[PDB]
Amino acid sequence: ARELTVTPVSARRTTSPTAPTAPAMPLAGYYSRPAPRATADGDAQTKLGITAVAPAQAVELRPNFGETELQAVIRATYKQLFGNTYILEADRVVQAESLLRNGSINVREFVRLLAKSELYKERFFHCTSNNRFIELTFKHLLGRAPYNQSEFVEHLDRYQKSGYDAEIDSYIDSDEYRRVFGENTVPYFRGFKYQTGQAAGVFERTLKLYGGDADSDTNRNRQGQLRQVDPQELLRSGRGIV
Amino acid sequence: SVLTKAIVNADAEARYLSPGELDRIKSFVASGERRLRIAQTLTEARERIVKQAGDQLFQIRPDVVSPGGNAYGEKMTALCLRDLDYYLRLVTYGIVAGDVTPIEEIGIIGVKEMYNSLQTPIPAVAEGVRAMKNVATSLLSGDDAAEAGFYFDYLVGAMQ
């Protein structure tokens, strides 16, 4: 029993020690001890309602693609343009998939054909308001929220003057699409990285537009197609007599 | 607090609070959010503050940390900063209470007798507190730094 009592720290509460005539050893480190707020990297992304998944990593047609890589690109383009919504195999644009299989079109032109398809018009254009349509087209094609209330007015005015197909082409022929997706990269979510020439409020707006990996820009939610970024909050960042 | 002090004087004279006493409760409570912010900032930087106080102290008195010094050695120095952490805590309490009642019962009444027993040099504890004032005060706006400073100078005063 001496050893048990003595020779052993034992259980009091917890904890011990460091005191008179004194002390104990397990070493130490000055910039070793972890600061209390305390934790992680990736808690940050994952904390919210994780958007663990977007930091991104684009997929593409690395010249000399396999049929398995091509099918992964096709599945990624449908998941990006239509969200997590189920698409029946009969509803797929088999002509555009055949053109991409033949290498006769690039991933940009395949995205153009999918965004001009009547299926995209039925789901997003006919079921939502023109302002909510523009928010979703920025989400699907550019991977971001809109920067200012001027972008909305320019896109609304172009849509009124030149119709639906010219409005879709305006996103895809943009120097922003070309600079950051090029010809062979599938569209992907970007609003979680500070990007050059951004507006800090784009992060918060892209979070509001990204309800997570189980959300549906699905056009059925009883109310149906609404809006999600506020006009008052949209106006902070700019407001001009464009 | 300001409340406790006002009331105790009221009850001891068998009376309701004065217009004056009522006024100070009102001015005090209006400064509530500000006082809470002053305590938060200082709570948030506590580890930095004691340290910089501790460096300022050992330059000014390298002897305390010398052969015949009360704080000589690694664990006689560890306890010394812990005491500096104690007093910063009490200073945050005082600021949110708007007087010293709490600061006083917890860490000045009896402090002469405690430290005399331990043979701790009291006036160099007062210096450690001035050192904390200097650090803490550099993390606060002019107006909040003064409001905080009164409570630091009180402790410095009571160790005297």
């Binding site: - | 560890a78 812990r82 952490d85």
Partner: peptide, 30 residues
């Protein structure tokens, strides 16, 4: 029920039955 007995969490002028829950223990850090 035990509601009458419940406000006995106030204890006395200053009497709390033992150990004040979690208590910070800064000595390691110092």
């Amino acid at each position: 029920p035990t509601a009458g007995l419940e406000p006995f969490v106030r204890m006395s002028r200053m009497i709390r039955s033992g150990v004040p829950e979690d208590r910070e223990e800064p000595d390691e850090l110092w």
